[PDB]
Each structure stands twice: as structure tokens, then as C-alpha cells.
Amino acid sequence: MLSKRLLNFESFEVMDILALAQKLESEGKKVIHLEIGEPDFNTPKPIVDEGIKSLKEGKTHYTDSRGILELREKISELYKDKYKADIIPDNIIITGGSSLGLFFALSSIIDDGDEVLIQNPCYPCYKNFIRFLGAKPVFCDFTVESLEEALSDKTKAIIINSPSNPLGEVIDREIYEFAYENIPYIISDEIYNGLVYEGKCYSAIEFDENLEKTILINGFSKLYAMTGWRIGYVISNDEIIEAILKLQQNLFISAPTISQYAALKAFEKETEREINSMIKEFDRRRRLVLKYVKDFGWEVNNPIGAYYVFPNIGEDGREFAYKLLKEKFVALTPGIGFGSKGKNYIRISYANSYENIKEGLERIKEFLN
Amino acid sequence: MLSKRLLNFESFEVMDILALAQKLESEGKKVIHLEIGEPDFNTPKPIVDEGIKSLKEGKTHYTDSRGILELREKISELYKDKYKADIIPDNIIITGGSSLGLFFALSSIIDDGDEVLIQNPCYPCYKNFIRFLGAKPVFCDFTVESLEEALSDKTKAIIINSPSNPLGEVIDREIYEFAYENIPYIISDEIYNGLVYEGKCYSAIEFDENLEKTILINGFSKLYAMTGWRIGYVISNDEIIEAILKLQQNLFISAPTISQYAALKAFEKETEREINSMIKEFDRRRRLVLKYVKDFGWEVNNPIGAYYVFPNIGEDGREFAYKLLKEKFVALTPGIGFGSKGKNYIRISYANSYENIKEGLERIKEFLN
């Protein structure tokens, strides 16, 4: 009865643990959550107040499907300042979150039979979007050699997520350079950009300033803690933006009105003040997690962004997770869920209060010894 | 370069007029808008205040992908009261608007090659969603005889929009009865339900109380004037709801948090008070429009819902629209856009202040004589 597409739609290997966590939590057992995929901070005050003010002024109808011009201008100015790339407001569309943006991007350029390159490990939703559109997801390490070996006549695009979920690492310059010379389309997922604790924020706009073959995806969910406000954006050339607009006009109409107006305050001095305070806290947490990981004898390799660490625990992450949860009440995400390469891995999210993370790590230390 | 899917995505035949309307509007000419597809009312006060309160309490993170339980319970109770149909909260999913809901519904049951029956005329987005999924849209009159002739071995579903956009009419009981005996799936679009001025509100839940073969789509955009809040919902049986959940978890995550909490106030005495006041005003407008239409010698047939009237002006709606706009500055929607059957038609929306509608109609009278 169900369609063929929905039959291929794989499920997240976290539903298991999530269920167990609620049971223990209902039994009155304090469960430490280190599997949270969203920041534990509230939305910055100036943004919240602007949302309140908008409601009082009746900003409740549909907006232009591209998104209010004022917002697109601010984002445009943002890119001309953070990077020396000049972008026109017409090259930007405000979407209902980063997830829809990505979906619309893939839809506009992928035909049945195409192959899309994605990193192993990567965001679990990528493969589902790709299959859904009749294309084939090609897993591969993001090294120059492996990318060369993965290329074919059907290779249509590559999805680069940097910093990445689950790794927490920043993709190197060479991967972008190789892709622009060899791959027809670069889809850059930069939703965690800004959440970088060492080095410089690397955007794809720096390699293809005319967005000739790149579709840039970003939003306000992570950097500004606006997950529930459902608002992101896509940037690309005229032909691609025009195509995404048609999809947007039919499937969604326009991003939530209150969020759009509220987001204007995200570029205020006071707000950037608050985000910098947030970035500092995340870094303090990241270091705490890295200290124990090295202590635990686990292997990682340069996690400097987002809020995840993906250690190689030398053993089955799936089983490790279950046992840890039942005995110490510590919720972790099994690595296998993000790719085959992650059987011996697990993802730790430090998007939880510092104290909770400490006790969480301490328990794990008591679990290993 | 663009994908095949986006190449088949037809455009709305309103972009023409819309452009012309902005030109005249910029020239300092007062244009009367009778092409508006959303209600001109603000969101009811109790809903707005609840949204303000939610923000002050930090309701800014993601919610369960099915939508907060409290909301689903209220909607569930709503159906048990307005209709004698009992529905469980698990049979409901809160979506980011009615458009996404419909898209997710079609995705879960349509395979490539399927044929979907849609009324001629109907909502322009239906055909685009259908093609996008590799199925074939089958236009037909919604009469028992024509539906029998349109059926085939590939007929997978039928989309019933009642009251309908563009007609403003309520679909009769027999069409539903025929569909449940002959068509595998009934997708009922009831987004305008409640906006009925004569008779009784007819829901599909009344013909298939167990939602064995129906997917019901409704939301808060029209009846409560929450278009920009982006929040609707889908109701169906377990297997279908479970499938739509997977799509929701990947493509959208969850409806905007502030809207969900704010919507709880839509079922308050004070709010229903305001919606009834709104319904009365719309009816006063509908009668004003019908008086002139009959005066104009135009033909309509029972428009008693939504806020549209689709008269047969005995001539090319497309051309009629252009001329009227340029001479009298009155924006109307050409009927041809909703289907081939509407060449000689045009859609008039009375989702504008009473006074504006009067002058608008008067101008048209001065255009005909």
C-alpha cells in the first residue's frame, strides 16, 4: 500500500536508545543526555523581543516567497563583511529551516540515476533525501585519492558539511578545490559555521564567489539557537535560485513571518555579544570532553567545530551505547548510524550544561575501569 | 543543468498580473486587490497573546516531530465534538503548514506511473506535486459519470478539496461515496472547512471514521487567519501517519514551536467568538459579490464556502483580466490558471475589506457598460 519511496526511507538508529532513555527517566532516574542535536541555549534576547514586537504589530500574514527583502539584504551584507564575497539579495531565499533548504537544493539539480557523493560518516538525512529523488548516495572518505576513485559519469554533486555532524571537524581547502575542478555541483552545508573554536571559518563562497556551481545552505538554527523558529536560507546563482523559488511557492509558500522579522535582530551588536559568550562556553565544554577522551584512550582527530566529538572507542558503538545507558544512565549516539565507517565510533554532544557533561564523563570513566 | 523534475514544474498564470499591479501601484494608482489568496483579518487576540507568552517563557527549541501532545489532543477532541468521529492523538501530525502536509501525504502513497484524479478546475499546486512524484494528474469534472470514465488500473487516489479553491463550492456526498467504493485512496483537503455560509460542514471523516483509506488535510491558515504562522495537520491511520512522520523527521523536524503553543488558544471561547464574527463578515461580502455577478449577467453555481466566486464571464478570462487591470486598476485572477475548463472564467476573492470590494465591483460595472 505504501509507496516505493517511503519503503526505502531508512530510520535513525537512535530510536532504540531514545525509548530506553524515557523509561529510565520515568522511573525517576536522572539520565545524562549527551545525544542532543540542538544547542541548550535560549534564543538571544534582542531576537526574542523583536519576535514579541512583531506579533503586537500583526505581522501574521504570508511574506514574499523569497523572504522579506530587509532580511536578505542583511545576510548579503554579512557575507560581504565576513568574506570578501559580494552577493545580491535576489541570490538568497529564506526557507523554513535548513532541512527544507537542502531538500529544495537537491531537487533542483538531481535526476533519476545520478550519484551524489557524501562523506562517511555524515548527517543521516543526506542519504534519505538522495534516494527519495531517485539518485544514488555514494559514501567515501573525503580525501583527494578516494574522491578520484569514487567519480563516475553519473556523479552529479557532492555534499560538503563543514564543520560536520557527526565529526565536529572542518573540511580542508583541498577537498573544495578538487570538487570545483572535477564535480559539476557543490552543495555546501554550513549550518554550523561560526561554531569554530580554532582557526578560521571556511565558506564555499570563498572558492566560487559567483556561485557558478555551488549551492550554499545555512540558517539560524545552530549559531543563534533558533531551532524551533524554523528559518534558514539558500544562496546560489540566478538559475538555481529561480528554480528553488518555484519549489518554495508550491510546497511551503514562505518561512514563518515572525521569525523573519525577529531574525533581523541577529545582526545587532547586543546579539553578537551573546553569541560570542555562547561560543566561549561551548569551547570550554569541548576541552572538558577532549581531556577525558584522551584519558579514556580513545582516538579523535581535530574536532574544532559544531558541538560534537566522534571518538573511535575501538569497539562496537551500538552495544557500548546500550550498556552504558542501562548501567550509568548516560545517553550516547551509536556511530554506525552515520555510516559504515562508524561501527567502532560514537557521537558525543556537549550541547548540555557543563556540570551535566562532567558527571556524564565521570560515569563513563567509572564504566571503563 | 536543471533537473528534469523542475523542468516540468508549471508556473502560476498570475505572475503577469501581479507584475502589472505593482507598476500601477508604484505610479501612485490605487489598485483594488480581488486576487488575494489569504484572509485580510489579523490573528485572533487570544492566539497572538499566547504566542507572546510562549516567547517570554523560552519555547524556542524543537518539539516532538508529531507535534506537542497537548495540541493533538485538542484537535482530537475537536473532531469528536464537531463530528461523532473519535480519533486518537497518535493519528495526528502537526506540519509546517497545509502545503507540506499535502506533499507528505502524496509522497507516502504515490509510485511512479500512478494516476491521481483532481477536479477541473482546482488548486494549481496539486498538479505540480503529482508530476514531481512521477505520477500523472488526471483532470475531470466531479460527477459520478465522469469519475467512472476517468478510472483506470493506474488510478491510485483522488484529491477532494471542499470547499474548493477556485470554485467556493462544497462537494456533494455522492462524490465521497463513489470514491470510497471505487478509489483506493481519498486525500481530503479541508483547509477552508468552517468557512461555510449555507448548510453543514462536510468532512471526509464522516464517510471513513477509521481513516482506512483517507488522509485528511487541514490547518490553521484560513479559518483562524494564521497563514504566516505556518502550521497545519494531517490525520490518517497508523501506517500512513508513521510514514509521514519519517518524512517530517527528515525534511522539516517539527512545526514552528511558537505557533504550536499559540494554536492551543484557538479552541478558546473568546477565539471562537472572534472567528464567528469573521465568518459573518465574509458572508456579508459574499452576498455583495453575488448581487453584482448576477447583475453582470455572469453565471455561477452555488458558491457557499471559502472566500472565492468563480463566474463564467462568457469570455476569455485571461484577456478580460489584463484589460480590467490596466483601465480600472482592478486585479482579478484568470480562470485558465486552475484548469482548462476555466478559459471563460475568473476567480474573485472577497478577502478584502467590504468597501474596497464595493468600489472594485462598481468599477467593473463601469467597464462592462
PDB file of C-alpha atoms in Angstrom, chain A residues 1-6 9-12 15 37-43 48 51-52 55-63 96-97 99-101 103-104 106-112 123-126 128-129 132-134 156 185 221-222 225-230 239-240 242-247 249-259, chain B residues 1-6 9-12 15 37-43 48 51-52 55-63 96-97 99-101 103-104 106-112 123-126 128-129 132-134 156 185 221-222 225-230 239-240 242-247 249-259:
ATOM      1  CA  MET A   1       0.000   0.000   0.000  1.00  0.00           C
ATOM      2  CA  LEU A   2       2.770   2.459   0.912  1.00  0.00           C
ATOM      3  CA  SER A   3       4.784   3.988  -1.931  1.00  0.00           C
ATOM      4  CA  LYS A   4       8.149   2.587  -3.009  1.00  0.00           C
ATOM      5  CA  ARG A   5       9.957   5.760  -1.913  1.00  0.00           C
ATOM      6  CA  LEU A   6       8.796   5.514   1.694  1.00  0.00           C
ATOM      7  CA  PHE A   9      13.452   5.567   3.714  1.00  0.00           C
ATOM      8  CA  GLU A  10      15.856   4.260   6.377  1.00  0.00           C
ATOM      9  CA  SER A  11      15.267   5.019  10.064  1.00  0.00           C
ATOM     10  CA  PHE A  12      17.656   6.656  12.533  1.00  0.00           C
ATOM     11  CA  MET A  15      15.025   5.472  18.307  1.00  0.00           C
ATOM     12  CA  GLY A  37      21.374  17.578  18.435  1.00  0.00           C
ATOM     13  CA  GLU A  38      20.412  21.159  19.271  1.00  0.00           C
ATOM     14  CA  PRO A  39      22.021  23.878  21.420  1.00  0.00           C
ATOM     15  CA  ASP A  40      20.860  24.141  25.041  1.00  0.00           C
ATOM     16  CA  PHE A  41      20.812  27.942  24.965  1.00  0.00           C
ATOM     17  CA  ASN A  42      17.751  30.166  24.684  1.00  0.00           C
ATOM     18  CA  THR A  43      17.400  32.461  21.733  1.00  0.00           C
ATOM     19  CA  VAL A  48      13.076  37.236  21.244  1.00  0.00           C
ATOM     20  CA  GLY A  51       9.522  38.494  17.768  1.00  0.00           C
ATOM     21  CA  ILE A  52       7.269  39.771  20.548  1.00  0.00           C
ATOM     22  CA  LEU A  55       3.269  39.846  16.972  1.00  0.00           C
ATOM     23  CA  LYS A  56       1.943  43.013  18.612  1.00  0.00           C
ATOM     24  CA  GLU A  57       2.100  44.718  15.223  1.00  0.00           C
ATOM     25  CA  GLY A  58       0.171  41.974  13.432  1.00  0.00           C
ATOM     26  CA  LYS A  59       2.996  40.535  11.296  1.00  0.00           C
ATOM     27  CA  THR A  60       0.952  37.365  10.763  1.00  0.00           C
ATOM     28  CA  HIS A  61       0.368  37.086   7.004  1.00  0.00           C
ATOM     29  CA  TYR A  62       2.414  35.425   4.237  1.00  0.00           C
ATOM     30  CA  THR A  63       5.533  37.297   3.070  1.00  0.00           C
ATOM     31  CA  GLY A  96      11.511  27.126   6.581  1.00  0.00           C
ATOM     32  CA  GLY A  97      14.673  25.808   8.170  1.00  0.00           C
ATOM     33  CA  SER A  99      16.457  20.910   6.176  1.00  0.00           C
ATOM     34  CA  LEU A 100      13.923  22.164   3.626  1.00  0.00           C
ATOM     35  CA  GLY A 101      16.603  24.308   2.025  1.00  0.00           C
ATOM     36  CA  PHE A 103      15.924  19.259   0.094  1.00  0.00           C
ATOM     37  CA  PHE A 104      14.990  22.011  -2.367  1.00  0.00           C
ATOM     38  CA  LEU A 106      18.945  18.609  -4.299  1.00  0.00           C
ATOM     39  CA  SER A 107      15.546  18.651  -6.062  1.00  0.00           C
ATOM     40  CA  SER A 108      16.559  21.388  -8.485  1.00  0.00           C
ATOM     41  CA  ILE A 109      19.600  19.580  -9.908  1.00  0.00           C
ATOM     42  CA  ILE A 110      19.231  15.821  -9.364  1.00  0.00           C
ATOM     43  CA  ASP A 111      17.719  13.452 -11.955  1.00  0.00           C
ATOM     44  CA  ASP A 112      16.988   9.749 -11.518  1.00  0.00           C
ATOM     45  CA  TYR A 123      24.418  13.598   8.539  1.00  0.00           C
ATOM     46  CA  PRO A 124      21.923  10.654   8.357  1.00  0.00           C
ATOM     47  CA  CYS A 125      19.294  12.634   6.426  1.00  0.00           C
ATOM     48  CA  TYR A 126      21.521  13.160   3.372  1.00  0.00           C
ATOM     49  CA  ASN A 128      17.376   9.693   2.557  1.00  0.00           C
ATOM     50  CA  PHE A 129      16.968  12.903   0.550  1.00  0.00           C
ATOM     51  CA  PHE A 132      13.917   9.834  -2.331  1.00  0.00           C
ATOM     52  CA  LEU A 133      14.841  11.734  -5.506  1.00  0.00           C
ATOM     53  CA  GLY A 134      15.867   8.555  -7.320  1.00  0.00           C
ATOM     54  CA  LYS A 156      26.254  14.915 -10.285  1.00  0.00           C
ATOM     55  CA  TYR A 185      27.806  20.794  -8.374  1.00  0.00           C
ATOM     56  CA  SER A 221      19.073  27.129  13.997  1.00  0.00           C
ATOM     57  CA  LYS A 222      22.539  26.442  15.404  1.00  0.00           C
ATOM     58  CA  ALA A 225      19.816  28.939  18.839  1.00  0.00           C
ATOM     59  CA  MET A 226      16.659  29.350  16.719  1.00  0.00           C
ATOM     60  CA  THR A 227      15.920  25.669  16.044  1.00  0.00           C
ATOM     61  CA  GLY A 228      12.187  25.913  16.713  1.00  0.00           C
ATOM     62  CA  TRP A 229      11.745  29.188  14.798  1.00  0.00           C
ATOM     63  CA  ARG A 230      12.268  27.177  11.579  1.00  0.00           C
ATOM     64  CA  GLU A 239      19.005  29.872 -12.448  1.00  0.00           C
ATOM     65  CA  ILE A 240      19.187  27.734  -9.325  1.00  0.00           C
ATOM     66  CA  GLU A 242      14.706  30.772  -9.550  1.00  0.00           C
ATOM     67  CA  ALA A 243      14.144  27.010  -9.518  1.00  0.00           C
ATOM     68  CA  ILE A 244      14.148  26.775  -5.723  1.00  0.00           C
ATOM     69  CA  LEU A 245      11.613  29.619  -5.653  1.00  0.00           C
ATOM     70  CA  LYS A 246       9.107  27.588  -7.684  1.00  0.00           C
ATOM     71  CA  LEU A 247       9.508  24.703  -5.250  1.00  0.00           C
ATOM     72  CA  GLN A 249       5.981  28.775  -3.762  1.00  0.00           C
ATOM     73  CA  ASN A 250       4.277  25.400  -4.150  1.00  0.00           C
ATOM     74  CA  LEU A 251       5.411  23.369  -1.128  1.00  0.00           C
ATOM     75  CA  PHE A 252       5.781  25.946   1.648  1.00  0.00           C
ATOM     76  CA  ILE A 253       4.778  29.455   0.478  1.00  0.00           C
ATOM     77  CA  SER A 254       7.167  31.311   2.842  1.00  0.00           C
ATOM     78  CA  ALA A 255       9.177  30.996   6.070  1.00  0.00           C
ATOM     79  CA  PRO A 256       7.280  31.835   9.270  1.00  0.00           C
ATOM     80  CA  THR A 257       6.590  35.565   9.324  1.00  0.00           C
ATOM     81  CA  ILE A 258       7.506  36.190  12.960  1.00  0.00           C
ATOM     82  CA  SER A 259      10.900  34.526  12.601  1.00  0.00           C
TER      83      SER A 259
ATOM     84  CA  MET B   1      21.769  21.700 -15.948  1.00  0.00           C
ATOM     85  CA  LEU B   2      18.489  21.851 -14.007  1.00  0.00           C
ATOM     86  CA  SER B   3      16.821  18.555 -13.096  1.00  0.00           C
ATOM     87  CA  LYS B   4      14.022  17.056 -15.188  1.00  0.00           C
ATOM     88  CA  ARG B   5      11.511  17.480 -12.352  1.00  0.00           C
ATOM     89  CA  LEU B   6      11.985  21.240 -12.115  1.00  0.00           C
ATOM     90  CA  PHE B   9       7.092  22.397 -12.812  1.00  0.00           C
ATOM     91  CA  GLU B  10       4.489  24.719 -14.364  1.00  0.00           C
ATOM     92  CA  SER B  11       4.219  28.353 -13.248  1.00  0.00           C
ATOM     93  CA  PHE B  12       1.152  30.179 -11.928  1.00  0.00           C
ATOM     94  CA  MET B  15       2.795  36.417 -12.176  1.00  0.00           C
ATOM     95  CA  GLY B  37      -5.481  34.161  -1.532  1.00  0.00           C
ATOM     96  CA  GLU B  38      -5.340  34.772   2.217  1.00  0.00           C
ATOM     97  CA  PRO B  39      -7.781  36.308   4.722  1.00  0.00           C
ATOM     98  CA  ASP B  40      -7.400  40.029   5.457  1.00  0.00           C
ATOM     99  CA  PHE B  41      -8.004  39.564   9.182  1.00  0.00           C
ATOM    100  CA  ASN B  42      -5.384  39.592  11.926  1.00  0.00           C
ATOM    101  CA  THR B  43      -4.882  36.524  14.031  1.00  0.00           C
ATOM    102  CA  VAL B  48      -1.448  36.302  19.500  1.00  0.00           C
ATOM    103  CA  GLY B  51       2.429  33.389  21.166  1.00  0.00           C
ATOM    104  CA  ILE B  52       3.848  36.372  23.045  1.00  0.00           C
ATOM    105  CA  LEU B  55       8.384  33.564  23.631  1.00  0.00           C
ATOM    106  CA  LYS B  56       8.796  35.069  27.102  1.00  0.00           C
ATOM    107  CA  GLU B  57       8.995  31.545  28.501  1.00  0.00           C
ATOM    108  CA  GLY B  58      11.681  30.418  26.058  1.00  0.00           C
ATOM    109  CA  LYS B  59       9.614  27.983  23.957  1.00  0.00           C
ATOM    110  CA  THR B  60      12.245  28.152  21.208  1.00  0.00           C
ATOM    111  CA  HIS B  61      13.578  24.603  20.781  1.00  0.00           C
ATOM    112  CA  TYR B  62      12.422  21.710  18.568  1.00  0.00           C
ATOM    113  CA  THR B  63       9.307  19.825  19.721  1.00  0.00           C
ATOM    114  CA  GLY B  96       4.642  23.282   8.867  1.00  0.00           C
ATOM    115  CA  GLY B  97       1.515  24.422   7.083  1.00  0.00           C
ATOM    116  CA  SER B  99       1.032  22.671   1.806  1.00  0.00           C
ATOM    117  CA  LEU B 100       3.747  20.487   3.338  1.00  0.00           C
ATOM    118  CA  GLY B 101       1.091  18.226   4.811  1.00  0.00           C
ATOM    119  CA  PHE B 103       3.000  16.984  -0.138  1.00  0.00           C
ATOM    120  CA  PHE B 104       3.892  14.449   2.562  1.00  0.00           C
ATOM    121  CA  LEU B 106       1.038  12.222  -1.663  1.00  0.00           C
ATOM    122  CA  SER B 107       4.651  11.087  -1.095  1.00  0.00           C
ATOM    123  CA  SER B 108       3.657   8.251   1.219  1.00  0.00           C
ATOM    124  CA  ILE B 109       1.309   6.515  -1.234  1.00  0.00           C
ATOM    125  CA  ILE B 110       2.219   7.507  -4.804  1.00  0.00           C
ATOM    126  CA  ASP B 111       4.591   5.484  -7.017  1.00  0.00           C
ATOM    127  CA  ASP B 112       5.862   6.427 -10.471  1.00  0.00           C
ATOM    128  CA  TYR B 123      -5.829  24.358  -6.710  1.00  0.00           C
ATOM    129  CA  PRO B 124      -2.869  24.925  -9.127  1.00  0.00           C
ATOM    130  CA  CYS B 125      -0.307  23.287  -6.821  1.00  0.00           C
ATOM    131  CA  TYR B 126      -1.965  19.852  -6.949  1.00  0.00           C
ATOM    132  CA  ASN B 128       2.801  20.144  -9.606  1.00  0.00           C
ATOM    133  CA  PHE B 129       3.017  17.914  -6.528  1.00  0.00           C
ATOM    134  CA  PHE B 132       7.054  15.950  -9.151  1.00  0.00           C
ATOM    135  CA  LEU B 133       6.436  12.481  -7.693  1.00  0.00           C
ATOM    136  CA  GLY B 134       6.350  10.858 -11.129  1.00  0.00           C
ATOM    137  CA  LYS B 156      -4.227   5.470  -7.102  1.00  0.00           C
ATOM    138  CA  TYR B 185      -7.122   6.452  -1.509  1.00  0.00           C
ATOM    139  CA  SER B 221      -4.082  29.217   7.945  1.00  0.00           C
ATOM    140  CA  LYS B 222      -7.578  30.060   6.708  1.00  0.00           C
ATOM    141  CA  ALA B 225      -6.044  33.637   9.917  1.00  0.00           C
ATOM    142  CA  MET B 226      -2.661  32.072  10.774  1.00  0.00           C
ATOM    143  CA  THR B 227      -1.173  31.926   7.265  1.00  0.00           C
ATOM    144  CA  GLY B 228       2.261  33.209   8.266  1.00  0.00           C
ATOM    145  CA  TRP B 229       2.481  31.069  11.421  1.00  0.00           C
ATOM    146  CA  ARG B 230       2.945  28.037   9.124  1.00  0.00           C
ATOM    147  CA  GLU B 239       0.568   3.053   8.776  1.00  0.00           C
ATOM    148  CA  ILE B 240       0.168   6.302   6.869  1.00  0.00           C
ATOM    149  CA  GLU B 242       4.008   6.549  10.685  1.00  0.00           C
ATOM    150  CA  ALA B 243       5.202   7.073   7.113  1.00  0.00           C
ATOM    151  CA  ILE B 244       4.513  10.812   7.149  1.00  0.00           C
ATOM    152  CA  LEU B 245       6.450  11.026  10.424  1.00  0.00           C
ATOM    153  CA  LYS B 246       9.615   9.690   8.772  1.00  0.00           C
ATOM    154  CA  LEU B 247       9.267  12.305   6.043  1.00  0.00           C
ATOM    155  CA  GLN B 249      11.674  13.952  10.810  1.00  0.00           C
ATOM    156  CA  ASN B 250      13.985  14.225   7.805  1.00  0.00           C
ATOM    157  CA  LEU B 251      12.667  17.198   5.813  1.00  0.00           C
ATOM    158  CA  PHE B 252      11.327  19.580   8.461  1.00  0.00           C
ATOM    159  CA  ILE B 253      11.905  18.242  12.006  1.00  0.00           C
ATOM    160  CA  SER B 254       8.820  19.944  13.532  1.00  0.00           C
ATOM    161  CA  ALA B 255       6.316  22.784  13.066  1.00  0.00           C
ATOM    162  CA  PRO B 256       7.388  26.161  14.477  1.00  0.00           C
ATOM    163  CA  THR B 257       7.391  25.944  18.265  1.00  0.00           C
ATOM    164  CA  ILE B 258       5.700  29.278  18.957  1.00  0.00           C
ATOM    165  CA  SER B 259       2.783  28.507  16.653  1.00  0.00           C
TER     166      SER B 259
END
